[PDB]
Ligand binder design. Structure first.
Ligand code: M9Q
Ligand code: M9Q
Lengths: 10, 239, 239, 10
């Protein structure tokens, strides 16, 4: 879950 | 009385981070879906908040001490405080003359009736505009405004946090910088710190009322399809 | 030689459904995210396809016999054929003069280089433009063009179908209407039916190459976040 | 799954 948030956090 | 070298460097990092993640000209607003005057303003506002979430994450990554936290605490802090941080930075565009957010011409001027064209009742809009007026009256300095967002973001009382002991350690160290800055560089602010802390509890009520109306939308697919994948992820209940 | 009353009513329902779900002026294109000349054209094209998917579903619901299918077969047929139906209706805007899709001024004129600004290599764009030329040369009537989309949509060889016996029954009944219409109302079409069936197998190769490049994008969140919730659902692998 | 497709199919 939260695949975009992990990526947006570099 | 004065501040220390490490406390002022926290100020130099937050103000620089806010300048790097905020545009006073609002030029990127043309890249959103155009505003339309059922739920005509929903596509434009969904892109407006999704764009803001990307900037809040950029501002969070430059807060000293936030990057050393676990990736799970960074998500729990961002998800539960995203709408609050957005409501804080939105005051930079709010104007007391027209009682609305002014970001451009007549298109990017979000009145109270425009947000109604997104599915929001006056149960949330009435305290929200009341919050913008009370915050605008404080005439917060750029250092105070960026400190309030960092304190609101590093709140330990967020559903989903794990290592809330270090989170409170970072927030109280951020509170001491704000409490001292008002005593030194802000004349007439003998009562300002208590007013800013009071605004944090007001954001919790705005966060609660916002989550109830969003939850009612999220169950109707014909409306949630107009959202963005980032908004659905941040405002979602997945964990 | 001539057609029956029930076969012509299928034609009256498909042509009316296509007129109700297609706009020859492309006025709704201004509601999308604006086109930009990494992956600058991705937001505009993602809204363009998401808008097309909504119209394909509206056209599918008016195909005679499609609504009596189970809700699961309607999804399996729509998901696996969405990009194919879109490539069929996109020929209505394609022009052989400039070898590009023309939907407005210089903004809505999608050249081959514009789709490259969405992450697509020439491994898919080269056969796709070759498909649009071969389809445009057929000069299909409005009845033939709407029949080809209904036949492509009711294909039994779709991954996920359950009652593929009725699906083949509906497709072959749709094929007999097309095979007879060309014999009666289309002069010089003694070989047209075989050319249209050949275009269906060409769409399968375009569908396969499209799914490989989309799959490579879907794993990178910084790109898939620019998609829409409907595109992620139709082009997704969930079942 | 397919919450939007179910709704879009009326
Ligand atoms: C966010 C910023 C700005 C303005 C913010 C505003 C003014 C208009 C109203 C806004 C967007 C507020 C509205 C009410 C909140 C909306 C979200 O929940 C949203 C909309 C709808 C939705 O969820 O409907 C569910 C029923 C999903 C997208 C937030 C900040 C407010 C403008 C600039 O200062 C930049 C800053 O960065
Ligand atoms: C769809 C229609 C029209 C044009 C269609 C076109 C022309 C431009 C190219 C289009 C959009 C084609 C492109 C290549 C396909 C794109 C999708 O996969 C998409 C983009 C990118 C993506 O997935 O990237 C992954 C790497 C997710 C959105 C389809 C039809 C083609 C215009 C009108 O005739 C209406 C009709 O209704």
């Amino acid at each position: 879950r939260h695949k975009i948030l992990h990526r947006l956090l570099q | 009385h004065m501040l220390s070298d490490e406390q002022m460097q926290i100020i130099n990092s937050l103000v620089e981070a806010h300048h790097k993640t905020y545009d006073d000209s609002y030029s990127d607003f043309v890249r959103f879906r155009p505003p339309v005057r059922r739920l005509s303003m929903l596509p434009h506002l969904a892109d407006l908040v999704s764009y803001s979430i990307q900037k809040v994450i950029g501002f969070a990554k430059m807060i000293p001490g936030f990057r050393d936290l676990t990736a799970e605490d960074q998500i729990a802090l961002l998800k539960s405080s995203a709408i609050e941080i957005i409501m804080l930075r939105s005051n930079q565009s709010f104007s007391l003359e027209d009682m609305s957010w002014s970001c451009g011409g007549p298109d990017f001027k979000y009145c109270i009736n425009d947000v109604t064209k997104a599915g929001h009742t006056l149960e949330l809009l009435e305290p929200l505009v009341k919050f913008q007026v009370g915050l605008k009256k404080l005439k917060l300095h750029e250092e105070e405004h960026v400190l309030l967002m960092a304190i609101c973001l590093l709140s330990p009382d967020r559903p989903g946090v794990q290592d809330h002991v270090r989170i409170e350690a970072l927030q109280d160290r951020l509170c001491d910088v704000l409490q001292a800055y008002i005593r030194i560089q802000h004349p007439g602010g003998r009562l300002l710190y208590a007013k800013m802390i009071q605004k944090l509890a007001d954001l919790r009520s705005l966060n609660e009322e916002h989550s109830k109306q969003y939850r009612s939308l999220s169950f109707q697919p014909e409306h949630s399809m107009q959202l963005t994948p980032l908004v659905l992820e941040v405002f979602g209940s997945e964990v």
